[PDB]
Structures are given as C-alpha cells and as structure tokens.
Amino acid sequence: FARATKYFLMWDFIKGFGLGMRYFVSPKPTLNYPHEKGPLSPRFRGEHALRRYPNGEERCIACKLCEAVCPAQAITIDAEPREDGSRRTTRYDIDMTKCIYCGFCQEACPVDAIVEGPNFEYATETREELFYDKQKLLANGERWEAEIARNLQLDAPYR
Amino acid sequence: MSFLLRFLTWWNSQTLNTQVWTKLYGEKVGEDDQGNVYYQSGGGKRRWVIYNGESEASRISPEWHGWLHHTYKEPPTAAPLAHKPWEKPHEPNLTGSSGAYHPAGSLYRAQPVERRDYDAWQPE
Amino acid sequence: FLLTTTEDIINWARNGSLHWMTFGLACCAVEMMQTSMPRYDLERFGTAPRASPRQSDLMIVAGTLTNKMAPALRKVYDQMPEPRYVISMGSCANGGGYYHYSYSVVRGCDRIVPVDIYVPGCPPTAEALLYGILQLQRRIRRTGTLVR
Amino acid sequence: MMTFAFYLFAISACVAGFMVVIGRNPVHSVLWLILAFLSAAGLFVLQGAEFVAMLLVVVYVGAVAVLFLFVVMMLDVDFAELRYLPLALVIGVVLLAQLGIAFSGWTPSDQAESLRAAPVDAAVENTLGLGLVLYDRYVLMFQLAGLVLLVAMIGAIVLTMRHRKDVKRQNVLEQMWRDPAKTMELKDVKPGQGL
Amino acid sequence: GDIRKNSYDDGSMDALTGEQSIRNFNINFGPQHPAAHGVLRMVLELDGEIVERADPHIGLLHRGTEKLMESRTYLQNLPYLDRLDYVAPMNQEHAWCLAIERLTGTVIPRRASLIRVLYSEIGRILNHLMGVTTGAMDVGALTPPLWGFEAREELMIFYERACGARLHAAYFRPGGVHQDLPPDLLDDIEEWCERFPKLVDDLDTLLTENRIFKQRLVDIGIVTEADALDWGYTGVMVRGSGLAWDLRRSQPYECYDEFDFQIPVGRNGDCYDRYLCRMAEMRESCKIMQQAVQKLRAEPAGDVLARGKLTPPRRAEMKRDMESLIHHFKLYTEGFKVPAGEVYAAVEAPKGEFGVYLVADGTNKPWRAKLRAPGFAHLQSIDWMSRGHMLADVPAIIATLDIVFGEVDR
Amino acid sequence: MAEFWASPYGFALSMLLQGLAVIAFVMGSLIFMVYGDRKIWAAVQMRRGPNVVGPWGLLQTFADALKYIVKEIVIPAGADKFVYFLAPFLSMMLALFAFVVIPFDEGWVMANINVGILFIFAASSLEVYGVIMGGWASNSKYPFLASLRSAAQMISYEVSLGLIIIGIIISTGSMNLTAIVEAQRGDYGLLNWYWLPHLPMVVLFFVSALAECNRPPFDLVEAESELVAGFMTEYSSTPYLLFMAGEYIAMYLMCALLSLLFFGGWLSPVPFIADGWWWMVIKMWFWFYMFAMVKAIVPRYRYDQLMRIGWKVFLPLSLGWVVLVAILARYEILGGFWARFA
Numbered sequence A: 001f002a003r004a005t006k007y008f009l010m011w012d013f014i015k016g017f018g019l020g021m022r023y024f025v026s027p028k029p030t031l032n033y034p035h036e037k038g039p040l041s042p043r044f045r046g047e048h049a050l051r052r053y054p055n056g057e058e059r060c061i062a063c064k065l066c067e068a069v070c071p072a073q074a075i076t077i078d079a080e081p082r083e084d085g086s087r088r089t090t091r092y093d094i095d096m097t098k099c100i101y102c103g104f105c106q107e108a109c110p111v112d113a114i115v116e117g118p119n120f121e122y123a124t125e126t127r128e129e130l131f132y133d134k135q136k137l138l139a140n141g142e143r144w145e146a147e148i149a150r151n152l153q154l155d156a157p158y159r
Numbered sequence B: 001m002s003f004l005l006r007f008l009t010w011w012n013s014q015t016l017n018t019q020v021w022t023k024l025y026g027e028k029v030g031e032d033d034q035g036n037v038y039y040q041s042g043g044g045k046r047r048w049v050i051y052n053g054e055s056e057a058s059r060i061s062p063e064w065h066g067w068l069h070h071t072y073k074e075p076p077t078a079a080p081l082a083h084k085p086w087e088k089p090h091e092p093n094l095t096g097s098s099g100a101y102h103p104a105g106s107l108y109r110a111q112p113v114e115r116r117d118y119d120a121w122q123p124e
Numbered sequence C: 001f002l003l004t005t006t007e008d009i010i011n012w013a014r015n016g017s018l019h020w021m022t023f024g025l026a027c028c029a030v031e032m033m034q035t036s037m038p039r040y041d042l043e044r045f046g047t048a049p050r051a052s053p054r055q056s057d058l059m060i061v062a063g064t065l066t067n068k069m070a071p072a073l074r075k076v077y078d079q080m081p082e083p084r085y086v087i088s089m090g091s092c093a094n095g096g097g098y099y100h101y102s103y104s105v106v107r108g109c110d111r112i113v114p115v116d117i118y119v120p121g122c123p124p125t126a127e128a129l130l131y132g133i134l135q136l137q138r139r140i141r142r143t144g145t146l147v148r
Numbered sequence D: 001m002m003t004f005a006f007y008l009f010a011i012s013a014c015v016a017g018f019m020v021v022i023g024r025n026p027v028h029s030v031l032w033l034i035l036a037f038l039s040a041a042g043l044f045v046l047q048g049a050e051f052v053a054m055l056l057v058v059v060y061v062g063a064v065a066v067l068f069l070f071v072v073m074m075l076d077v078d079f080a081e082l083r084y085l086p087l088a089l090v091i092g093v094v095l096l097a098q099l100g101i102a103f104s105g106w107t108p109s110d111q112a113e114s115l116r117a118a119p120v121d122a123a124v125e126n127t128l129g130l131g132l133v134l135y136d137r138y139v140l141m142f143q144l145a146g147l148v149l150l151v152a153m154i155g156a157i158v159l160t161m162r163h164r165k166d167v168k169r170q171n172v173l174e175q176m177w178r179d180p181a182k183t184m185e186l187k188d189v190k191p192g193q194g195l
Numbered sequence E: 001g002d003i004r005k006n007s008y009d010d011g012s013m014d015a016l017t018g019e020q021s022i023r024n025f026n027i028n029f030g031p032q033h034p035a036a037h038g039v040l041r042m043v044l045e046l047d048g049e050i051v052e053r054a055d056p057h058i059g060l061l062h063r064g065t066e067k068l069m070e071s072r073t074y075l076q077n078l079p080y081l082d083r084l085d086y087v088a089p090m091n092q093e094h095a096w097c098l099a100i101e102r103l104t105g106t107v108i109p110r111r112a113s114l115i116r117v118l119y120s121e122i123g124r125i126l127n128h129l130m131g132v133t134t135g136a137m138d139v140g141a142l143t144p145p146l147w148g149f150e151a152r153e154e155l156m157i158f159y160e161r162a163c164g165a166r167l168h169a170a171y172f173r174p175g176g177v178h179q180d181l182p183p184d185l186l187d188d189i190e191e192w193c194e195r196f197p198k199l200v201d202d203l204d205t206l207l208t209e210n211r212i213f214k215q216r217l218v219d220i221g222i223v224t225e226a227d228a229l230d231w232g233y234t235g236v237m238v239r240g241s242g243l244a245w246d247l248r249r250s251q252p253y254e255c256y257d258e259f260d261f262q263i264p265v266g267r268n269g270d271c272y273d274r275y276l277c278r279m280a281e282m283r284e285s286c287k288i289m290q291q292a293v294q295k296l297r298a299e300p301a302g303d304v305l306a307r308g309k310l311t312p313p314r315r316a317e318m319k320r321d322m323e324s325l326i327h328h329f330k331l332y333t334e335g336f337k338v339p340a341g342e343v344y345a346a347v348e349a350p351k352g353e354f355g356v357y358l359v360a361d362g363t364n365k366p367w368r369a370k371l372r373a374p375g376f377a378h379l380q381s382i383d384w385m386s387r388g389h390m391l392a393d394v395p396a397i398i399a400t401l402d403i404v405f406g407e408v409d410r
Numbered sequence F: 001m002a003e004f005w006a007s008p009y010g011f012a013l014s015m016l017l018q019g020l021a022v023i024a025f026v027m028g029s030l031i032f033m034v035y036g037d038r039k040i041w042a043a044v045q046m047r048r049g050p051n052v053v054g055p056w057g058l059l060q061t062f063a064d065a066l067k068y069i070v071k072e073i074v075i076p077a078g079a080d081k082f083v084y085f086l087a088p089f090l091s092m093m094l095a096l097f098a099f100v101v102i103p104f105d106e107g108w109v110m111a112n113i114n115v116g117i118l119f120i121f122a123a124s125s126l127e128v129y130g131v132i133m134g135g136w137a138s139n140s141k142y143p144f145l146a147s148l149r150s151a152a153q154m155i156s157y158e159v160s161l162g163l164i165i166i167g168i169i170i171s172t173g174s175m176n177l178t179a180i181v182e183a184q185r186g187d188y189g190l191l192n193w194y195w196l197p198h199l200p201m202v203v204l205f206f207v208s209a210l211a212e213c214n215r216p217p218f219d220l221v222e223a224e225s226e227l228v229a230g231f232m233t234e235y236s237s238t239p240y241l242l243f244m245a246g247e248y249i250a251m252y253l254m255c256a257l258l259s260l261l262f263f264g265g266w267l268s269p270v271p272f273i274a275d276g277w278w279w280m281v282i283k284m285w286f287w288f289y290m291f292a293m294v295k296a297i298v299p300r301y302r303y304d305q306l307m308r309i310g311w312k313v314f315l316p317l318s319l320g321w322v323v324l325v326a327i328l329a330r331y332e333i334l335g336g337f338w339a340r341f342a
C-alpha cells in the first residue's frame, strides 16, 4: 500500500527529477581539449624514442634484447661494426601498427636506449608514416629528451 | 573579418566561450617561444594553454608538456628543464604536409632507396 | 571569391556535424566510449553517435578486424551515404597489431575500406582518439570539397 | 473561390475512391482511402458542416491505420506480382447514368421547408446546434447507438479472443511490488565454504 | 522447450501453422547493432516480436589467441590475457600468473599479493560500472552510463599511475607485480573510495525503484538452480539465483581470507536480482580496496617480484652485478622454464569464473593454453533464456549475462 | 495603401505574410530547440554538450542542417519509392500545419475556427502516418517492426486523449482555442488557470504528449537498443532531416497545447505584469524543458506496457474524471470553479 501510494503520486519520477536537477547545477569535470589535457604519470607508455648519452653518443649497442622480448615482433634490427669499431645498429625499425605499447622493450633494454615517451598525439594520414626507422626514432629522442630524462628520474626508485 | 573568425570557428586559438572562461578564471602562468600562453585555476588544479594561431595540440613543446599534463607540479618558468646541447627543437605533427616522415623506400620520397643484399658480377 | 568560400562553409558544416556510426569491435571501443563520456565529451564538438549507417558520416574502426567480420564492416561502410570518412583506431585496425600473424585476422583495415586517419596505440587513449578526430577535421578543411 | 475549392476536393475524393478499388497494392489502397476521407471532409467544411468534417477525419485516421495493421498481418505471399471487368464497368456506367438523370430534375417537395425537425440557425455555431438536438430530440437514437457499439465490443471479443499459453508473461503490478530489500541479501561466507 | 508452433489457451490450430515453416521472420541482430557489442551476430526468429529462436553466431572477434600463444614465451604471452575480458584486464592476467606460479612452485611477496587484491577489486568495479550502466542504456536509460563512466575514468587513471597504461596494464607478472605503487597513489585511491558510495546511491536513486526499470527487469531472464547447472553458470549468474558461491571464499587465493566482505545473493534469479547483486558487489569491492590500502601502508617495505630464477632483477642491480645482468639477459630472451605438467587455475573474475588450462612441457613456451571464459558459457544459454520473451527484452538479457567478446571468441 | 490592403491581393498577401510569421517562429525556434534539448541532457550528464560550433555551440543546429543538405540521398533498391518520399513529407508538413490554429496572443492566430481542438487532433494523428508509412515503405525488417510499433503507439495514447481534455471543454463551453484561454482569465493570476481545477488531466495530458511525440519513456519507434534506428534506419540527408524536424515541431505543438489548455496561454501569472505573447513563449519553453529533462532521467517502456497504461490506467481515469467534472460543473460546486461558461 505504501509503495502503491508513492507510485500513484509519481514519487519515483519526482526523485529522479530532483536528482537530475542536482546534477544539472553541479560542476562539470569536462576537459576543454585541446587547451586542457588529461593527467599523465611518469610511467605513461607513449610514442617510442631512441635516446643518446649526455656525451651525445647513441645509447643503443645493438644487443637485440628489445627485438627478442617484443611480444608483437614489432622491432627489426641489423647491426655491423661501425667505422670506428663500435657496436651499433644500421637498421632499427619499429612497426607502430604491430606494436602493442606494452613497454617490454624499455624494460629489456640494458642501457635505456629505447623508451616509450610521453607523446601520444601523432596520428597520421597515411599508414606508412607509422613505420618508424632509426632516424625517426632518434629524432624523437632528441626532441623529447628533456621530458624523458625527467620521467626516468621520477620513476627510477621503482625500477 | 577578425571577429567573425572568432565567432564562427573553433580551431583558431580559442572559441569565444573559452576566452570568456579564461578571463573569468584564468591566471597567467607563462609563455612559450611560439607565443602560446599558459593559465591555471586553483593554483594548478586546472591548467590550460591559449594557442597563438591554429589550436593544434601537438604544438605544445616538451618544455611545457609535463606541466600541462600534470606530470610535474611546477611550471617551467619556476623549474626549467635541463637540456643537453645535442637536443633538437620541438616540431608539431607534420602528417598532412610535405615535411611528414616517410620510410626511405616510400614512393613519396621521389628517390626511393634501392635495396639489395648481394653484389652482382659485371661483365668486362 | 565564391567557390572556395562555398567549400569553406561546406567544410565548416561537415566538421561541426560529424556523426559517427555506433560501431566498436574490441577493446579499442572501450577508449572510444570514454571519449564520449563526461571527462572528454566528444559530443560537445558536434561529433555525435548514430546507430544507422544511413545517418553516419564517419566510421571509426575501433578494434581487431577478423576475416569473418570483414564482409560485415565493408557492407555497413558501403551503406554510408557520401561523403564518408574512416578513422583507423589502434594497432589491430592500423596493421593487425598483436594478432598480425594470425590465420583469422585482417592485417590492417585499409585492406577492406579506405582510411583517412590512423590513430596509434593499443588502445589509443581517449585523448589520443580525440586528437585523431581533430586531425581528420584539419584534413577536411585542407582538402574538403562538395564531393568530400 | 468556392468553385476552385469544390473541384479540388471533389476530384480528389472521386479519383481517390476509384484508386482504392482498382489498384492492386492493398497498402496503396489504404493511403488512397484516407485521401478520399480527407477530401470529403473538405467538402463538408465548404457546406458549413464543420463538426462532422473534423469528426470524420479524427475517426477514419485511426480506423484506416487499423486497416493497415490487418493488411500486413494477412499480407498475401505474392506481393511482388500483386475477372469480368468489362461487363462490370458497363453496369456501373448504367447505374451512374441513371442516378445522374434522376439528379438532373432534383427538386425538394414544396413542403420540405415547413417539415424541418431541426432548422439551422445562422447565429449558432454548427457544433452547438448539433448538441442542442442530438441528446434531447434524438435521445432514443443516441442510446441505441451505444448498444450498437456494445454489440461490436462483445462480438469482436467473442469471435477472436485467444492468448498464447507458451510465452513468458509478467504481472506489471507484481513487477512494481518487488522489494529490493527482500530480493537481495548479503551472506557471510566463511573461507573454504561451498554450497 | 519449443514454441515455434504457437499454442493457444483455446486450443485453436491455424491453417498456416499446419503447413511446414519455410518462410519465417529471421533477422540479423548485430554485429553492427547498439545492443550487440559490435561483434555478435544473433539470428532471431520472431513471431509477432516474440523470440522463438535465437542463434548466436560468434567468432567475429576470434583472433586465434590460443594458437598465437604457442609460439611465444610465458612472459610474451602475458599481454594476451589483458585482451580477453578487456574491460578488466589485470583480473585476467591473474589466472595466467597463478597457473605459472603453481607449476613452478613459486611464492610471491606479501606486498605483491596485497596489490593484486587491490587492483583486482578495482577491476571488479571497472567491470560492474560498465555492466550495470550500459545495461541501463540497453533498457533506454541514457544518463546512467555517463555518471558511471566518469567513475571508470578515475579508475583508469589509477591503472595508468601503476603501470603507464589506462587499459592493457601488463602489470601482474609471474612472481608478483611489475612495480610498486607510489605513496601518493595510495592516498588518491583512499580518497576515491570515500566518494564512490555516493555515486552508487545516485545510480540507485535513479534506477532501483523506478517503475519503468522494474518493468524492464523484474521477472525477466529467470534462472533456477537447475538451469545454472545446465549451462555452466558462474559468478553473479549463480549468485542471483541464491547460491552463495564465490571463488574468493569457496576456493581462496591470494590473501582474500583476511579481508572482510560479504557475498550478495538474489532470491528470484531474474535480471533485477542480478542488477542488485552487481550494485552490492560494487560496494563490497570498494570496502576491500579500503582495507588493502590500509594493509599496504601498514606493511614493511619489501619487493614486489619474487626475483630468483623467475623474474628479472632490479635495474640498478642489473647494471652492477654480473649475476643480475645474466639473469636479466636470459629472462628477457629465453624466460623461465616451466616444469612439465598441467594445471587449471581459476579466479573469480568480474564476469564469473575465468580460468587458464596450461599444459607445460618443461620448455620456455606453453604446449597448450586453453582459456576458459565465463561469457562463453553464459552466451550459449541465450537461446534457452530468451525463448518466449519479446524482442524488447533481448537487449536486457544480453546485458544481464555480462558478455565481452574478447573472451568469448579469444 | 488603404486602397491596396482591402483588395483580394492585399488580402492574399496578408495570409502569406501571416503564414511566413508562423513558419519563421516555428522554424526559428527549431534552431534553439535542438540545441536546448542537447544542452539539457548534457548538463544532467555532468558534461557540456555542444559548445564549440559558434559561441557556446549556438550555431550547432545550422551546421547539422547544412550537413544534411549536402549529404547524398540514398534510395533503397527495394523501397516503395513514392511512399518512401511521402512519409518524411507528411511528418514535417503536418506537424507544422497544426500551428495554423494555435493562438499566441489576443488576435494572433492565423485561423480562428470553432473546432480548433478537433482540428489539432485530426492533424496530429494524421502525422503518425509518416512514421507508419516511412517504416513500411523502406522494405527492411527494422523499419518494418517500427512501423507496427507506431500503429501500436497510436492505439495506446489516442484512446484516452479525447477524454483527457473533454473536461476543459466542459468548463469552457467551447472548442475554440482562444476561448479556452479567455476562460482562464481572472483576478488571481495563475490561480484562474485550468491546471488547478483539472490537476489530474495535466499529468495525463503531459504523459500522453510524450507518447504522441515518440519521446522517452515512449521512444519506441526508434528504440536504438532494440531497433537500430527504427522507422528511420533507411533514411539519409534531408528526408531524414524532415523526420527530425517533424519530431521537434510536434513536440513544440504539445508545448503550445499544454500552455494553452492548462496555463492560460498568453495570460500573465501575476496581475501587475501585462499579458502578451511573451507569456505564451515562456510557458512553451518551460514545457519543452520538461520534455528534455524527462529524456535525461527515464528508461524505456516495452510497447505492450505502454498499451497497458493507455487502456487500463489512463482510459478509466480520464473517463472517471469526465463524469466527475460534469457533476461538479452541472451543480456549480464551489461556485462554478469548474463551470467557467457564461
């Protein structure tokens, strides 16, 4: 009876209307993209980059641990002795359409050469722009180094 | 036609309602070398940028990227990022342009790199 | 001028009223859904979902395309009236991703339908997809005509 | 103009009525039928019988829609490819000609004016005029109409009513009475304990 | 159990019903259909919108995961688990880790165990928020998903702050969890837990006693105990019928014994009961999250991985000690060997019992990896469940079964 | 100009200008109705809604409309082509057409007919044929199922729609829409409006209006989660635009009727502010706001449950009310509180 009375007076609809109006006048959490952005932690796995040492030399020494661990087989590497005898790659490709952005490669790298950076806004108009070669990856590292280095420092105590 | 651009478009530095909101609640934090202006409310609880020109999110440089995405507490004005001498200046996304990256063998390149893995004998 | 400013108006209307088919295949659809949720509110751009391809201008291929599914995706794309745009979202749709070497997977949705934008990630974040949608708008502004 | 208004409604109704009976598509017949009733309502307005003009549309908009439901419920299996027509058209023409000849010399009785049971008043609106006679002078017919409608109610239910007994049904009031407090409860399940 | 030939309470037999049924009303319900989750092709036979036959065609998201797993190491296969019931990825990772840990006889550190419970219950809320509020959208309520997915957004940020990914964490590892949680993350999880019950009340105020909501769910999809045993039901699919079965209690794993939570059960076993059970489970998971954060703070500092011969060392050790560098090199290329044997390791995943049947043969790669998805068994019963209902009830029944096709198809 | 406005031409131009005023108001309001509808759902949903296309998104409906004008018309191969294009035409045309008898102020009505209530009923019910014929003419299963649901919807809300307003005619003594407003004039502002003596019928009319407009909780002919787009699944570009235009115009008509029949039309709620078309528009947009809020907070009925409401709840209640009102009006209970006729 009490439940029958409340349904006759449309109480369930009135409660909904009141709840709707409370939300109506409340602050909106919406981000004003592209002016306002979502939060990214230092661990965020974004676009790949190849890093250099503070002395300007490449960090990668063609050990191929990243190519071996890659669950998606997204990495392809060829190496030779450089002209000075250094152990360096001649090809370092990442197929970004195969990659699952798992971050295993940066875990496997013993010299912090390959990392997943903070950048995530690099959508392309053609598919082949996502076949990253060595120079593209190194260019990413030279442009994003300052933020990448700071993120490595922030997460070092947990790695 | 300057005002109309502001009235009718949403990809030119800000909409009219973004500008009003910034004036009401915005507190300037600094500027980058492109002329993008950074703001905050609540002492950095909310952080946003007003673009100088086309509002393209890939224009935000690594200098400000960490602050704008709340990775770092303090703006680069107060806590500048250390830069190595071999670093290169930031570039936005170039995908729809002629500066877009393409693989060496791409037909866009107009001189695609020829590939082989053996040397052929040449008759004398 | 008349014709370029006419195209600008057409491109303005098409960018501001970009309706996308309710079509999600896999875990890329979860992030696509978050893009329409309050934190990002994709609909505030005028980019609203439409259940029927007859009312859709944009197809977001959000997830793995299997061989068994490929004819169905092509059919609903074929039933989109023109202009129609396609965004490839995530590794599976972009190139096959984690299942690239599988016997039952299409190695990239561009083997079935033409693609306008590729969004990288597995999944791309809700914000990355929103960026990709705005890159499509730049592409239409740059090259849009009455045909598309 | 009145001449233009008459022929618009007159031609529309007569053409629509013809299309109802000779067309092969039953759904097209349904749409021609509603056009005939709308056209006849237009003629009624021209004559100042506005209430029955509007009542006619209200009634037959719903009734014609019901006819559409039965057309699709009993739709023939040969929709894709959906007589003595010559002789029938001859008898129809003969009947129409006879009626036209009878209407050529139409004249009411010279007593017709004095015998009117409900003379029309210019100052009274049509709906009010009908209401003044419908329920008092014609009260006996009014009550019989109610019984005519009751017979239709009884007949339709008597003839056709049946219910599937093999489908799942819910009592709406019992759905609304379901108490969440009674229908769900929390259990303290100890570790290692099954059903 | 066959209603195609209509049966009437007056015993009448129509002339057409006598003829053999050759021209039936068959309709493709999905894959491109808002209620079909994108990849369900359900062929429905309708009779005046009564569902007389439902024929789910699945495999439109079959990607050959179990074949792909046979040519990868155990570590390389961990991300495949994320992408089965991808609404709550770490919960699926847990079964893979448990199976490997059982075969190798490995004990994971205490802190890793607490973190696994913490993020498993985050996953349960991530799933139940999606299930309940999109289930509401299936019966026409537009608003609930918007409120619920804002709370999901916050939980996905907790995912990202732990592992760097919002969805596909790859965070649970054989031997524990990859990384430790920042202290400020534990503060934020505690702060979120204090607000969350308010959203549950708001969703409850909007839906629970709404007469329309009740008329769309009450007495729909009734499941009896006997039905549950026909179709391999697990999770809320059995608890909604009143069977207080929950693997965290009946067959405890990790450290669930020492947590305080209760098992909600239903009395009528219909869509309304299972909705109430899921709402109640969300409250219980929030309480577990609160206890786990308190235990983690009270814990002494320790490792999150077992190290040894199963997991790589820490990066600082890898760059200093010869043994650590070797173990890093070998475990990221070859990986650990798993002794020959076969195990079935099951967890109470948010959608029901999820299990891995792992056949190891002593090498670094699985011989066979069979993935047992709860949704596979639940979806199979839709023909029995939907028979006799109307077409409008179908989306509600799809919702109540809690189907994600990453795990149905694998 | 006097020599002009008295002629047939000045008479013919007067009607055309009056017709353009109605189309301008109804179509102009349509720009802000679609915008306002979406903004209200968004606000209840902790989000913004359209806010980038123009200032605060205020040009969004122009963008949507233009997009459809340059969108291809796809004609299904198996569709009945004449009935396919007739259905959207009827849907938009008849909804707009019903406004010819709507008064907005004293003397601001294009057609002041004695049977205005019945004409509204005739035109709105005939508008349903657009949905029924649109679904059937597409010749595909989802639009076909929606076509039958549309017929079911008509049977559900119309059986008691006449009875719901018979009380207002009894109190007024007229079906003229302007007369109904004048019957609500008095010395106590809003306390003279019919919402008070006929409080139960305000609820029943509002609910019936939602069903007549295919609006939640009765959005059954579209019902995305069950039928993809229902009767509109096979429609694109401007033919589809006409169905949406008709849906909002029909909604706007119900907002007008709610305000005319129960809230005094253009009369002032307070004695000291003047009566005028501003009060009519304010009340119309309050009721539109109620339409939008309902969409944001209710789920969807099954269409057999809608039929239960019409026949087992609304029909007995409205019938009982008519008898009760007749007794109260006949005997002038409370001094003619229900007998407003002279």
Ligand code: SF4
Pocket: A066, A069, A070, A071, A072, A073, A074, A075, A094, A098, A099, A100, A101, A102, A103, A104, A105, A106
């Ligand atoms: S992120 Fe994972 S899938 Fe991508 S290249 Fe690195 S290891 Fe391979």
Ligand code: SF4
Pocket: A059, A060, A061, A062, A063, A064, A065, A066, A067, A077, A105, A108, A109, A110, A111, A112, A113, A114
């Ligand atoms: S990037 Fe690192 S792991 Fe990969 S080859 Fe170079 S040094 Fe080795």
Ligand code: SF4
Pocket: C026, C027, C028, C029, C062, C063, C064, C089, C090, C091, C092, C093, C097, C098, C121, C122, C123, C124, E083
């Ligand atoms: S790309 Fe990654 S997130 Fe997207 S559907 Fe494929 S596996 Fe899922």
Ligand SMILES: [Ca+2]
Pocket: E003, E004, E005, E006, E047, E052
């Ligand atoms: Ca049958």
